[PDB]
């Protein structure tokens, strides 16, 4: 069962990379996830989610200029080609971000707040309270893993002695260290909720096989569960 993964590219490149579908089959060859496979072909645009990484031999904050705002097939929110200095890279795009615009990639955690635009990225210690943020890390320098999908956004709630507390779009709160960078504003491509599929052919185009037809009886879990919101998730380490 020869399954060598398609993600074998050790250098970051702007060029779209050929990707192989899997069909829900893991490395053994059996299905692990049902109802996936056989869509239109796609290519992968390597997104850089560490929004503040300086260029080589440059250290401080740096500026960047938007070139295009494309459509990425591999996600919901569309992406943006961004150029600055002597390199280009794909980043996730925010709402009202068009071409030619100039965005900031800051590191300096100021004394007071900074009245920031809907594009640029500051550390969470410098952002004003109540700001709508997205693409937050969980550790300083990890990379954006939370809010990324189309039109989703997290609010910054309070800034405490060495942390900042974030509310995810699932409303579960999450505190993180003060120096974690996060971009401002909602992610692009709102009204992704309002998409109508229209026919079963589009669901086959997206790469999704239909549901199986065996009638399963609903058990105890199927009722509406009114639960309390889960306790806050802490990534701040304490000795």
């Amino acid at each position: 069962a020869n399954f060598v993964s398609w993600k074998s590219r050790t250098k970051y490149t702007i060029t779209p990379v050929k990707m192989r579908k899997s069909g829900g089959r893991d490395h053994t060859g059996r299905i692990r996830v049902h109802g996936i496979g056989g869509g239109h072909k796609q290519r992968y645009r390597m997104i850089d989610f560490l929004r503040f990484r300086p260029e080589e031999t440059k250290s401080g904050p740096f500026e960047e200029k938007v070139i295009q705002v494309r459509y990425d097939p591999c996600r919901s929110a569309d992406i943006a080609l961004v150029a600055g200095g002597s390199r280009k890279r794909w980043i996730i795009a925010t709402e009202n971000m068009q071409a030619g615009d100039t965005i900031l990639n800051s590191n300096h955690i100021g004394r007071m707040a900074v009245a920031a635009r809907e594009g640029d990225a500051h550390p969470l210690g410098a952002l004003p309270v109540g700001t709508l943020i997205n693409n937050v890390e969980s550790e300083p320098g990890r990379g954006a893993q939370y809010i990324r999908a189309a039109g989703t956004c997290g609010v910054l709630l309070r800034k405490v002695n060495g942390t900042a507390i974030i509310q995810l779009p699932s409303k579960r709160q999450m505190q993180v260290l003060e120096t974690c960078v996060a971009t401002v504003g909602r992610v692009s491509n709102v009204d992704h909720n309002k998409r109508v599929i229209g026919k079963a052919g589009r669901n086959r185009w997206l790469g999704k096989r239909p549901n199986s037809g065996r009638w399963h009886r609903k058990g105890g879990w199927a009722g509406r569960k009114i639960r309390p919101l889960p306790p806050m998730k802490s990534y701040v380490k304490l000795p």
């Binding site: 060598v4 993600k7 074998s8 990379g143």
Partner: protein, 76 residues
């Protein structure tokens, strides 16, 4: 950061050498004398290079000891 080299597609690290190479003053009895793999142990091979240079199997020198290497970058 997010490193782009997936572990399954990278070159695997070799297995840890068998424990006879930690015992001092003791030489192991390995299959280098029979020129084929068996189980039960493993040798350590010296580096090899071609004595006579071959144009179809030529390997370049590393880049900072090319004779045209400059520290400052030019832009073609």
């Amino acid at each position: 950061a997010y490193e782009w080299g997936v572990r399954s597609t990278r070159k695997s690290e070799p297995p840890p050498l068998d424990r006879v190479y930690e015992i001092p003053g003791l030489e192991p009895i390995t299959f280098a004398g029979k020129m084929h793999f068996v189980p039960w142990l493993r040798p350590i091979f010296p580096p090899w290079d071609r004595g006579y240079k071959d144009p179809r199997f030529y390997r370049s020198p590393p880049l900072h000891e090319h004779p045209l290497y400059k520290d400052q970058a030019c832009y073609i």
